[PDB]
Amino acid sequence: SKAVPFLEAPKALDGSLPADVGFDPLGLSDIGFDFTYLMVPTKWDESRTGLSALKWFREAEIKHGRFAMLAVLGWVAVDMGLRLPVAKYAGYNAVQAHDVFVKSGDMTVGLLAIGFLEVVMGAAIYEMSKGSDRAAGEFSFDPLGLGKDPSKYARYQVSEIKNGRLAMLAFGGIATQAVLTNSGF
């Protein structure tokens, strides 16, 4: 491997996935369970060859990274003010805004909307398991167009996954610390 040199490799981390360095001490990328069956419990389709656990984990990692990046942006925003131009959003930090907004019937709306988007893109994941050429985390979302020049696309890929790992860990710290750089415990 290129990290943890005293372990050769998991088994499936050949390098076909971006941002691959070989770091997987527990060998989690070799579970034979096709996690698409957590969505569609049965084979359903006779053409459902199956999805490798590594590809499902890559999709989950990309989704986690995007969620964590947006989450740290939002949590940092509400520490330095920046409230929505509307009533009922006064100042109630981030450690308490979640509960008060769950009370005020709009976190349920956010849950519904996020679930709608998640269901559509999980249908995308299921089609990938069925055998579509779509790669993990690829929703073909390039509106501004900074995704051409394949070298730039690969660099931005590795950038997104590394930034997502950093943002996951940073959000874990921020939520655990209740923020120290911009507020108090």
Partner 1 sequence: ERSKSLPFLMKPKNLDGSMAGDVGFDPLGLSEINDVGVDLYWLREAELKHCRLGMMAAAGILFVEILGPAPGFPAGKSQMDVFWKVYAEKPSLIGASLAAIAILEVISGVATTQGRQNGDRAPGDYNFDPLGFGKDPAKFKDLQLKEVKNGRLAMIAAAGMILQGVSTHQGALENLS
Partner 2 sequence: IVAGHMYKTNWFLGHSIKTILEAHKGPFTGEGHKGLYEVLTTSWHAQLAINLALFGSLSIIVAHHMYAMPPYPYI
Ligand X SMILES: CC(/C=C/C=C(C)/C=C/[C@@]12O[C@]1(C)C[C@@H](O)CC2(C)C)=C\C=C\C=C(C)\C=C\C=C(C)\C=C\[C@@]12O[C@]1(C)C[C@@H](O)CC2(C)C
How far is Cα of residue 49 from the mean position of the Cα atoms in its chain? 25
> Whole-angstrom Cα distance, residue 175 to residue 97?
13
* Contact string 45-74 vs ligand CLA (x = CB under 6 A): -----------x--xx--xx--x--xx-xx
Q: For residues 41 and 105, which CB has a smaller minimum distance to partner 2 in the complex?
A: 41
The alpha helices in 104-149, defined as continuous H runs, are 107-130
**Does 153 participate in binding partner 2 (rule CB under 8 A)?**
no
**Does 110 participate in binding ligand CLA (rule CB under 6 A)?**
yes
Question: Crossing angle of helices 53-79/107-130, nearest 10°?
Answer: 160
**Does 119 participate in binding partner 1 (rule CB under 8 A)?**
yes
Any idea which residue has 């940073």 for tokens?
170
Least distance (Å) from partner 1 to the CB of residue 72? Answer: 26
**Does 42 participate in binding partner 2 (rule CB under 8 A)?**
yes
**Does 43 participate in binding partner 2 (rule CB under 8 A)?**
yes
> Whole-angstrom Cα distance, residue 94 to residue 90?
12
Report the 10 Å Cβ neighbour count for 75.
20
Tell me which of 2, 88, 98, 134 binds ligand X, using CB under 6 A.
98
Task: Report in angstroms the alpha-carbon separations of 42 from 52, 123, 131.
Answer: 16, 15, 16
> Whole-angstrom Cα distance, residue 89 to residue 15?
47
- Kindly state the helix (H) or strand (E) to which residue 153 belongs, with its residue range: helix 150-177
**Does 115 participate in binding ligand X (rule CB under 6 A)?**
no
Q: Which of the ranges 2-10, 93-101, 158-166, 172-180 carries the binding residues for ligand CLA, by CB under 6 A?
A: 93-101
Query: Phi, psi at residue 64, to the nearest 5°?
Result: -60, -40
Tell me which of 17, 53, 54, 97 binds ligand CLA, using CB under 6 A.
97
Q: For residues 76 and 175, which CB has a smaller minimum distance to ligand X in the complex?
A: 175
Six-digit token string for 56: 């499902």
- Contact residues: ligand CLA, CB under 6 A: 38, 56, 59-60, 63-64, 67, 70-71, 73-74, 77-78, 82-84, 89, 97-98, 101, 106-107, 110-111, 113-115, 118-119, 122, 125, 141
- Contact residues: partner 2, CB under 8 A: 41-45
